Structure formats: C-alpha cells, structure tokens
Subunit: 333 residues, 3 copies
C-alpha cells in the first residue's frame, strides 16, 4: 500500500512527539493511532488557520467527521504549514475507512465531538477554571479518551481503560494545561491567550501585563496558582498509567506524562517562564538512574518531581497552602 506508506511519512513530518512511539505500538493499534493522529492533525490545521473565515470554518469543524467518509473530500485553500494533510486528505481517509469498524466508531465519534467543541470556542477566550477544563477536554481530553478507547477496542488493554473516560480525560488535561502554562510568552507574542481570565484578572487588568518586568511578582503568583490547579490531575495520571498491561502502550502514554511533570517542576516559581521558554531541570539523583518504562519507576519519577516543587514552595505565595496540600494528598495515596 503506497497509501499507508504516505500516511506514515505524513506522521513523521507532522508529529515530532508521537511519531516514533506510535510506530512502536503492537498489532492493530499501530495503524489505528497513526490514522487517529493524522485526522486530528487535519482537524487542527483547519481550526488553526486564521485565513479561513468563521463562516467557512464552523461548517468545516462540524462536518469534519463525515469528510472521513467522502472519498474525494480534500481542502485546497489552507495556508498552514501542515496543509498537505488536508490537500491529500483522500489518502488519509482511504486508510481510515480501511480500519476495523470498531476503530472507525471511536475516531469518528471523537472528530465529531472535537469539531463541536472547537466551534464553540472559536468566538471566546477562556474565563472560568471550569471553562479551562471544558476547552482542554475538547482539545486534549477527548484525545485521551479516544486513544484509550482504541487501546481497549484492540484488546491489548482491558475494557476498563476505554470505559473510564474521567481518567482518560485527566491524562489529556494534564498535558494540555502544562503546555498552556509553559507557553505563556510564545502565545502572547502570537496574539493568543489561553490562561483562564477568572484567574489572571485577579492579578492584572490584561493577560499581556505578565510580559512586563514590573509585573513579574504577580505573574509568578498566577503561574503558581495554575500549576497547582494542574497538579490535581496527578492522582488520575497515576491511576491510569498503573492500569496499563501492554509495554508499547505504556511507553506511549507514560513518557509524555513524565515530560509534563518535569516541565511543571521546571516552571514552578520561575521568573523565566516570562522572559522565554523554560530550561528543563538536570533530573534528581534518583530519577537519573531510571527511565519511564515500568510503573514503579514512573511513580518514583513523579514523586521526585513533586518534591522538587514542594522544596520550592515559598510561604509568601498566596497558593502555598494549596500547593502543599495537593502534593501532600498525592504523596499519601
């Protein structure tokens, strides 16, 4: 199949982070996740493109899940860098239709719901923390849920993995919030705001005020609060990861979670989050002799990064009790 081979090239051109771990997935999961990724990538490139007017965008996002079924559908007017995935969509959608019906149900359900969610947020920033969760659910939680339903449909993981959508959602929210926290400056420089207004407006009048050197003490307080919010997903991350029985699936799910915990540790109480992108830490003496390939070691690596955070909690921070408390809760479970 030249078609399937073109899918794998698109994956390597398009997924810096998951291309290799996706290709190491056992049996039927390999193609199903490869394709899942490519359709979400296409959806994202559409949602992403500021050149497409909302009048054209809303229908594109709503009906995307059905383009999956229309052999000749493609989109020729994208201005995004990943636009080949839209221009050669018939190739991706052919292989999609070539998957076991059970995987198509999952992929198409996620595209459908993602599309609806994306359309809702086209017109609005995030206000409340509840709304932060809603946004991350649509953009990342559903990816967690989708993947997790693919693992279970393949029988490489027990049915609980797909059934427990709350744990799957938590996996996505944790990476998504960590990315949003990490990228404050790069997003600000690009006219994009993802930090929840109900939170930042308690510190400054505009989100962009975090970029100014006189507001750094406030910016960091806000940072620490959001980081603390994000840590609440850790018990679910640990629960989810500890249920996995397949090595290829475990590598795929664990590695991004570990990287995210490390990022949060590097960001906590860090002024640098606001002068640029943040330098990830050296790794503690215990983490250095472990990688993220069995559950106990993952646990230990997460616990260690929790301590790197706990060690740095300064009493004058207004979230300090809260940050101590969640970490403390996680440490005790």
């Amino acid at each position: 199949s030249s078609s399937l081979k073109t899918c794998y090239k698109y994956l390597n051109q398009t997924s810096r982070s998951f291309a290799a771990v996706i290709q190491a997935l056992d049996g039927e999961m390999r193609n199903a996740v490869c394709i899942f990724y490519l359709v979400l990538r296409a959806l994202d490139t559409l949602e992403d493109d500021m050149t497409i007017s909302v009048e054209k965008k809303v229908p594109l996002l709503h009906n995307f899940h059905s383009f999956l079924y229309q052999p000749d559908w493609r989109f020729m007017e994208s201005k995004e860098k990943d636009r080949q995935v839209l221009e050669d969509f018939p190739t991706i959608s052919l292989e999609f239709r070539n998957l076991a019906e059970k995987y198509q149900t999952v992929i198409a359900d996620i595209c459908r719901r993602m599309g609806i969610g994306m359309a809702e947020f086209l017109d609005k920033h995030v206000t409340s923390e509840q709304e932060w969760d809603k946004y991350c659910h649509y953009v990342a939680g559903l990816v967690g849920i989708g993947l997790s339903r693919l693992f279970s449909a393949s029988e490489f993981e027990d049915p609980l993995v797909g059934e427990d959508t709350e744990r799957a959602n938590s996996m996505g929210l944790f990476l998504q919030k960590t990315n949003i926290i990490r990228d404050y400056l790069e997003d600000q420089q690009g006219g994009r705001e993802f930090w929840p207004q109900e939170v930042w407006s308690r510190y400054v009048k505009k989100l962009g005020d975090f970029a100014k050197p006189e507001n750094i003490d406030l910016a960091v307080q806000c940072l620490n609060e959001l980081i603390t919010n994000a840590l609440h997903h850790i018990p679910d991350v640990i629960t989810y990861l500890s249920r996995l029985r397949n090595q290829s699936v475990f590598n795929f799910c664990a590695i991004p979670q570990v990287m995210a915990i490390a990022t949060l540790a590097a960001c906590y109480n860090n002024q640098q989050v606001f002068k640029g992108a943040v330098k990830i830490r050296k790794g503690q003496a215990v983490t250095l002799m472990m990688d993220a390939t069995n559950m106990p070691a993952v646990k230990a690596i997460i616990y260690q990064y929790m301590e790197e955070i706990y060690h740095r909690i300064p009493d004058s921070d207004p979230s300090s009790s809260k940050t101590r408390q969640i970490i403390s809760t996680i440490r005790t479970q």
Copy 2:
C-alpha cells in the same frame, strides 16, 4: 486520607531526600510498612547522633527505644538535631506503627531492639578492627537490610527466601554504610565523629584528623583506597541478593541505592577531593538485573583503570575486581 499517615509521609519527605520516592513507589502494604520503618529508624538514629544527650541518658533511650513504639504518649523534646521533629511528634509515628499488621510490627520492633543494643555498645568507643567496622555497620545498616528483607517476605511480594537470607541482606547494608562513611570523612571529622577503623588508619597517621591536612594527602588517598577495596568485597553478595528479587517496585528500591553507592565509590577511588570537600559523582537504567550488572561492571572497570601500581592496596583492588568480573 488518615491525617496521621499524611504527617508520616510529610516526615518521610523532610528527612529522606534519597529514599522517599522509591519508598512511595512500593507495592501494596510495603509502602506504609517501609515508610514507618524508615521514620522509626530515623528517630533512633537522631538519638544516637545527638551529642547534647549524655551517654548515661542516651543508653536507656537506645535500649528501650523498641518499647516506646508501644507507649502512645512517648516523645523526646530535648533533641537539638536537624531531624528532631520526628522525635518531638513520635506519637503520630508510633500510632501509625500500631496500625500496621502485626507481621510488620514484629519485624520493626525486633530490629529496633537489636539496633539499640548495638548503638549503645559503640557510644563509648571508636571502631578499632575491621571485624569491628563490620560489627558497627551491622548494627546501624546491616540490620536495616535484614529488616527490610523480612518486610518484603512478610508482605508476600517477595519469596520467603529473600527474608531468610540474612547474610546477603546484611551485606547490602554494610556496603551502603561503608560507602557513606568513606565519602563523609571530611564532614564527619569537622563534626567530631570518627568512623574510619583505627587499625586501618593508624598504619598511615597518628590521628584520623591528620588526613585533613595537605601534607598527609598521599597517605590519606592510600588509606581511602584500602577502605574502598574492603567495601568492594560486598559486591558479590549485593549481586546475588538483587538477583533473587522478583517484585519490580522492591527491585527498584533495593537496586538504585546500591548502584548509587557503587558510583560514589568509583568517584572517590584514588580521589584527593575526598579530603578537601565533596566529590562529583559523574544506554541503560537500573531497573532490570542484567542492566544493573552491566552498570556495576562498568563502574568496576573505571576503578580498575585508575589503580596506581605504587598504591599499597593495588594487588588487592585488582583481586576483588577480578573476582567480581569472573563470578
């Protein structure tokens, strides 16, 4: 959820930068049992270490420490040590100790009882012979090894053969203790504690504190190298002990500190820095036995390669390393 247990894990993290994360990663009942064992031992260490407690007050403290586990109101408010918090709020610790299955209690109390006798015995004296060095390390670290192994077996996560093999469990403790005592010459000397065995150092200098001055550095590295050579004798037992373990969380908990000690010893070997300050510890991680073996073998080759011919222990260093490689 227990506010008492939350406090214990808080303490674990305050006092154990090194072991906390792997203790927390332990499967099932081992997690709480090892947490409590660690805190109880940390309380007992703190009493031992504290120089403001007169020997006559300290002896009963160490002797009777195991009984305090069963005295709900017992605590010590007089310590000035860094980890005093664990003695000052001992009731919270001993309460969580009493919530453990008896199976675990029996082991912890038994180790405390024996450790206390041992600690008290060495209060008055400095370590003389190598046999004595072993005895002291047996009491403060070998017993920990033995108690830990008995906890793994009692929990059923490890085979009964793990807890029954007390000799190799003891060697696991002796190796960490000796490495730490080798590494901390300088820290120990400027806090007025002597742990280097006298029958060894007294062949090089008149007072153990002489290794701290520049003009005795040659002799100092000589004695250092002799002590490291002694410590390496434990590595075979370490490999055998680790090879028996079948639980991955226990394996990580046991293996990582051993591999870290081996790295320390490799960094310290022939290294003058031991006497001038702290030492820089410079496709595999330590979570399966064949990888651990290879890491260990590599560190050994790093020692083998720096062996100076002139060094008094050179042949002996070569011998033990040769033995380990061929095993």
Copy 3:
C-alpha cells in the same frame, strides 16, 4: 575460582571496552561461552590485521586457527599489534575454551574455521561489488552473529529458531560491520586499509584515497550517503531478530550495539566531518533520553527516531535521495 578464567576476563576488559560489561551480564552458561568466543575472535582478528605477517605466512595460520584451539601449547609470539597478549597467552584462552561444554566448542570452532577461510580469501584482493561487500562482511561479522545465535539456542536461553535463522543473524553482523566500515573511512585510509566497495566509490572518484582531499568533499559525501543507504537495508532483519529474543540479558547484549550502530549512521549521514575526524556521536530528543534499549517497543521507537533524523536531512541534490526515502519508508511498514 579458576585463575585461568579470571585472566580471560581481564583480557576481555582490555580488548573490548564496549561489550565487556554486557557480556559479563549474560545469564549462566552464556557468560563464559561468549567471553571465550570474543577472545578467540579477537586473537584471529589480530592475526588478520597484522601487516608484519606476510600473506604466505598468514594464510596457514588463518586456515588452521580453529585447530589451534585443541593445541594446548599453541601461542603466537611475533605479533606487534596492540592486542598481541591474546596470541602470546593463547594457551590460557584455549584452556578455557576446552572447558566449555562441547556443544559450545562445536559452534566456536565451526565459526573460526569458516571465518579463517573467508579472511584468507580477502587477504590478497579488495572489495569490488556490493555483493562482495556482503560476502566480506559475512565472513568477518555475519558469522559472528550466526555464532552467537547458535550459542543462544544451544544454551536453551533462546528458542531454537534464533540459531536456525542464519539469514537474520547474518544481517545483525552485516549491519554493525557496514556501520563500522562507513564510520572508519579516515582511520582506515591513514592505515592503508580499503573496505569501501570499489564498484561504488569508483563511480565517484578515481581512487578511494581522494575522498580525504578537501576538493572532492561533495562527491565523497554522496558516496557516504549511498553506502549508508545500503546498510539501512538490514534494519528490518535487525528488528525481526530482536523481536524474537525472550531472555533479558541476551536482549540487552544484542540490542545495545544495534542501537549504537543506527545512532552512528544517523550522525554520519550527510556529514562532512566523516572525512576530517571521528564523528561526534550524539543523542536524539528527550524521548530517547527518556528510554533505553531494554524492551522491544523502546528499541523500535529509538530506531524510528534515528530513522527520522536521517529522513529530514535528505537533500534533494543527492543521487540516492529516492532510494534512501524508500528504504526508510519500508522500515516504517
């Protein structure tokens, strides 16, 4: 224990910086078998490489080396090579060889005999065609892979299939040997050794020595790229071979050099420094930092990451562009 065997392990550590620890980590009977096999191979290689031994003197030694194993007093005193100690104290090595179980003796002798024949044949000729390049590699490395595999099967630590599939074991050795030859172009030049197949390099330059001249650096890299492309053909067999291993210590032993070999090709690909010094051997992204070659999915992901490092660097200008992309694409399938 045996003082004889201790001497063997000293020699092992003197001669194999790379493999020693990993060989020492092998389970049970395999440890001494592979240690002794390595040393015997090392002694044979030393006879082969030593240019102070005339072809006429050398051939009969290569031919009879397999039988010297049963001559307790046999030693060689006239080598001036670095590892001459293994020839000079060969009786110690052959003593321990004769202490191996007989089923391991049979294997080691058989390989030594066939390697000797091969080595004799190439002592007087250079490598012409790619076919001839596989044959030479077969003789000096492919057979090592075959020998090792048969040791694995005879020990019952691996399935009988491992030893039987001689083709897949051959590809493991070919991949290493081709990688070393590719990496070592410059050191080999300065030593009067030529291993690049002439039917390949003669289509670029009149004399293999010209790649060392600054002027032809562009034609040089192009050959460098075509040979790399040739080596990449073995990777699917490497993956297949690795995928069959069930013993951890054996897996570790087999996977790690294959990974170091792919890492080396990635680094050498399109890299001009292959003709100025030794190539700065280097790391991937944080995911290869977050994994190590000790399980099959992790090795696949590591392989795929290095696969993409090469893919993204393929210049259109290059005459092998199309075949490099096709082989990589094949590996991704």
